[PDB]
Structure 1
Amino acid sequence: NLNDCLEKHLPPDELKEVKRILYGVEEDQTLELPTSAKDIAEQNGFDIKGYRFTAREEQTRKRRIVRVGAIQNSIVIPTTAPIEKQREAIWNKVKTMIKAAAEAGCNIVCTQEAWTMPFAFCTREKFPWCEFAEEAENGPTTKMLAELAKAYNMVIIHSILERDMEHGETIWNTAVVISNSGRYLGKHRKNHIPRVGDFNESTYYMEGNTGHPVFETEFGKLAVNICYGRHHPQNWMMFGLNGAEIVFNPSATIGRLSEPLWSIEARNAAIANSYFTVPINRVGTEQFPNEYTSGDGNKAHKEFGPFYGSSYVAAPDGSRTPSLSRDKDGLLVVELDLNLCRQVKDFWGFRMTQRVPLYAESFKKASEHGFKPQIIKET
C-alpha cells in the first residue's frame, strides 16, 4: 500500500498536507469493524479495511447510510486443471470473503471483472476458456450467489463471462445484479471493448447493447462501469445522467503504463458526476499452459501479470479511500451516506452547468461522415 509507505516516511504535520492533496482528507476516516469479521479475514489470509464517508444533516431527508464491500482476489489453483475445479476453488474463497462482508455489516458486495476465471484473454485461445461462460440468470454462479444474497440480506454485484443461449450462444462480458431478496435484478454488458496488448477481449466478445442501466435497490441507485469503460468519461457521464449514486468499476489491469491511471480515472468520474465510484482490480500473477505474445517486439511467455489490486472508493466531494494491497487478497468495507451526492451537486453545480443539449448536438455532428472539425487557421 502507498498510504502505509507515506505514513512511514513523513512527519505527521507534512503527512497531513500530502494526504489532503492526494486523497481528500487530512487523516483517514477509519471505520471500526466487528472482531468476528477481522477473524475470518485473518484465518483465511486476506486484508480487511473499513473507511467512512459522511454527509451534512438534512431537514427533509434522513441519513441514507449504506455499507459496500469491494472484493479483490486472485485465482486459486493452477490454470492447467479442470475448469470446474478452478471455478469452485475461487467460489469457496470468495464465499468466506462474502461471509466476512456480511458480518462487517455490508449491504452491497461487488466483485472484480470476470472473477470466476483466470484472465485467459491474453492467450487468445477459445478452448477450453470459453467453457467458463455461463448463463447470466441461470448459470451456477448466479444461483449460488443468490442463496448468499437472500441469507445475508445483501445486494450482490458480480462480473462474469456470459453465454447468451437465446442469441446464438454469443459470449459477453456482463455484470449481474442480484437483489437482497435473492431475486435476479438484471444485467449490464460491457460498453467499451479493449484490444490493447494482452487484453485481446475484442477476440472474445463485441460491444454491449444494454445501454447504461442503473439499478434501483433498497440500498441506493447502483451502476456498473465495466473494466475498459474506465477510460471513457462519456460512459461514466451517462450512468450519472441516469441517476446513479454508486458506480462500481470491476476491472483487471496489469502493467507499468496502466497503473498511473488507476488513481486518476475512477477518481475523476466521481468528481465530475457527483456520485460514488468503486474501482476494483484483480490481484496476483497468472501463468498459462501455452506460450503467447503481447503485440510488442518481445519473446513468447506464459506468465500474465502481475495484477496490481489497489481497489479503492472515491467520493463525490473529491475525497477518496486509501487503496487495498497491490498483491494480497482483500475486502474493502466502506460506510457512506448517499445524501452526499445531492449536497455536492447543489454546491458545485456541475449538473446545473453541463449544457447537455449543446454537447448532444456537437457529438452528433462529430459522428457524421462529412464532419469538418472546428478549426481556426491563420488567414
Structure 2
Amino acid sequence: GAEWKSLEECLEKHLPLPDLQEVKRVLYGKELRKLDLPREAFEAASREDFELQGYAFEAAEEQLRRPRIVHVGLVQNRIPLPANAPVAEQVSALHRRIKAIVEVAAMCGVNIICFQEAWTMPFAFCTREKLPWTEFAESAEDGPTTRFCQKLAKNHDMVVVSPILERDSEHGDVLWNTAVVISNSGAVLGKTRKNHIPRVGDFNESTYYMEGNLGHPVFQTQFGRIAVNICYGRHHPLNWLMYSINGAEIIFNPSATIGALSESLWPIEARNAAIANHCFTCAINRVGTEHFPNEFTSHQDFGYFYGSSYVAAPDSSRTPGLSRSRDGLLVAKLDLNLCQQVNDVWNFKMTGRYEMYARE
C-alpha cells in the first residue's frame, strides 16, 4: 500500500454522506470541528507541496478554570535527497524543508511542534554499516541541527521537538537515539533517550546504540508538560503509563516504522494509551521510501512508510490521519482542560488497583 492515499480521503470519496458520517463516528470517534486556519496559509500549503490539516478538540467549559488552548503541530516529511548523498548536503536540505513548514505553521498559532524520529538523517540501521551512516550523529547539546532548531525556536516562539542521533562523545563517542526538546526561548529543555530498541527484521537498531538510561523525563514548557516517546516505546503500554505518571500532558511519538503489520498497530496503541492515560498523545511517522546503494537481508529499498500522522485525545477522539504519500503538517487545537475532566469521570487511575497490579 504505497499509491493508496489516506483512509479518510478514500472513505469520503466512495461511501455516501450518512454512511460516511456513521463510519466516522465509529472509527474517528466524534466529528470534531475543523480548525479555522488562515486562507493564505492554505495557499502556502499548496505552494510548498505539503498538506495542511487543522482540527480543534472541544472541551467542557469550566467556571473556575479557563481553557488552556494550546495549538500543536506535527510535521511528517520525506528525505528530499537520496540516502547516498553527502551528510552536509542532506542535513542542509532537511533543515530548509523543515524550516519552510515551520514558517507556514508559525502563522497559524502553533506553540509546540514535532518531527519524525531522527529527521536529520535517513533511517539506515537496516544496512548494519557503521560508515558513513554513523557520521550523521553529533553532540545533542551542541550540534549544527541543535543550533539550527534553536534558531527556529527563538524567532517563532514555538516549542520544537527535534529527534536526532546523539553522538555521546563525552562518554566514549557512542551514538544514542535521543530527541532534544527546546523551549520557545531556544534553550534545550532536555533530551529524552530511547528506552526500547526494536530488534526485529529490518529494524537492526540494536547494532547502533543501547537502551536509554535517561528513564522517563517530562519536559515542562510554558504552555504545558510534554513528553517524547520513541518508535519502539510505542508498543509497550507501560512506557505510556510511566510517562503519564510523571504528569506529562501531551505525549509525542516520533517514529520511523515501516508499513504492513505496524500499520495495523498504528491507530491502536497510541489511541489506547491516550484513553487509558487521559493525556493527549501525538503520533508521527515519516513518509516516503528510502533507497540504498547496498542491499540488506532482514534489498535496495527500505520498504514504504505509511506516514498517517495523527493526534489522539483523552475523550477517545482522534484527528484524521494525514496522507500516506505526500509529506504534510497537522495543526491540532488542543484544549488541556478536557484532559483532566475525562480523567475525573473515568477514574481509570483510581479504579486501576495499582496496589493489586504493580505489586504483582
TM norm. shorter chain > 0.5: yes
Name 1:214's counterpart in structure 2.
218
Q: How many positions carry a matched residue from both structures?
A: 355
Name 1:159's counterpart in structure 2.
163
Shift of 1:4: 1.3
Shift of 1:35: 2.5
The 4+ residue runs of structure 1 with deviation greater than 6 A are: none
* Contact 1:3/1:323 (8 A) holds in 2: yes
SS in 2 for 1:346: helix
What per-residue deviation string (whole Å, max 9, x for no partner) do you get for residues 201-257 of structure 1? Answer: 011110011111111111111001111101000000001111111100000111221
Name 1:366's counterpart in structure 2.
none
Whole-angstrom CA distance in 2 between matches of 1:70 and 1:214 = 19
SS in 2 for 1:80: coil
Which of 273, 277, 286 is 1:269 aligned to? Answer: 273
Whole-angstrom CA distance in 1 between matches of 2:353 and 2:141 = 39
* Contact 2:53/2:330 (8 A) holds in 1: yes
Shift of 1:18: 1.3
1:227 aligned onto 2:225: no
Residue identity opposite 1:93 in structure 2:
R
Name 2:181's counterpart in structure 1.
177
Shift of 1:67: 0.4
* Contact 2:95/2:148 (8 A) holds in 1: no
Which segments of 5 or more consecutive residues in structure 1 lack a partner in the other structure? Answer: 295-300, 363-379
Residue identity opposite 2:67 in structure 1:
R
Residue identity opposite 1:98 in structure 2:
V
Name 1:36's counterpart in structure 2.
40
Q: TM-score, normalised by structure 1?
A: 0.92
Matches within 5 A, 1:179-258: 179-258=183-262
Name 1:18's counterpart in structure 2.
23
Whole-angstrom CA distance in 2 between matches of 1:135 and 1:39 = 37
Which of 305, 308, 314 is 1:307 aligned to? Answer: 305
Which of 318, 321, 329 is 2:319 aligned to? Answer: 321
Q: TM-score, normalised by structure 2?
A: 0.97
Name 1:369's counterpart in structure 2.
none
What per-residue deviation string (whole Å, max 9, x for no partner) do you get for residues 267-299 of structure 1? Answer: 1110000011100001000100212111xxxxx
Shift of 1:39: 2.8
Whole-angstrom CA distance in 2 between matches of 1:344 and 1:191 = 29
Shift of 1:12: 1.7
1:149 aligned onto 2:153: yes
Whole-angstrom CA distance in 1 between matches of 2:40 and 2:140 = 33
SS in 1 for 2:343: helix
* Contact 2:32/2:58 (8 A) holds in 1: no
Shift of 1:86: 1.0
RMSD: 1.0
Which of 4, 13, 23 is 2:9 aligned to? Answer: 4
SS in 2 for 1:289: coil
Shift of 1:11: 2.2
More strand by share: 1
Shift of 1:29: 1.9
Whole-angstrom CA distance in 2 between matches of 1:36 and 1:196 = 44
Name 2:3's counterpart in structure 1.
none
SS in 2 for 1:152: coil
SS in 1 for 2:15: coil
Shift of 1:40: 2.5
Shift of 1:28: 4.5
Name 1:367's counterpart in structure 2.
none
What per-residue deviation string (whole Å, max 9, x for no partner) do you get for residues 313-355 of structure 1? Answer: 1000111010001011100001011111110111111112222
Which segments of 5 or more consecutive residues in structure 2 lack a partner in the other structure? Answer: 1-5
Residue identity opposite 2:267 in structure 1:
S
Residue identity opposite 2:125 in structure 1:
F
Whole-angstrom CA distance in 2 between matches of 1:267 and 1:19 = 15
Name 1:377's counterpart in structure 2.
none
Residue identity opposite 1:12 in structure 2:
L
Whole-angstrom CA distance in 2 between matches of 1:147 and 1:345 = 37
Matches within 5 A, 1:38-57: 38-57=42-61
Rg: which structure is higher? 1
Residue identity opposite 2:21 in structure 1:
K
Whole-angstrom CA distance in 2 between matches of 1:210 and 1:324 = 31
Name 1:346's counterpart in structure 2.
344
Whole-angstrom CA distance in 1 between matches of 2:292 and 2:304 = 13
SS in 2 for 1:61: coil
Which of 110, 115, 121 is 1:106 aligned to? Answer: 110
Name 1:336's counterpart in structure 2.
334
Which of 121, 125, 130 is 2:125 aligned to? Answer: 121
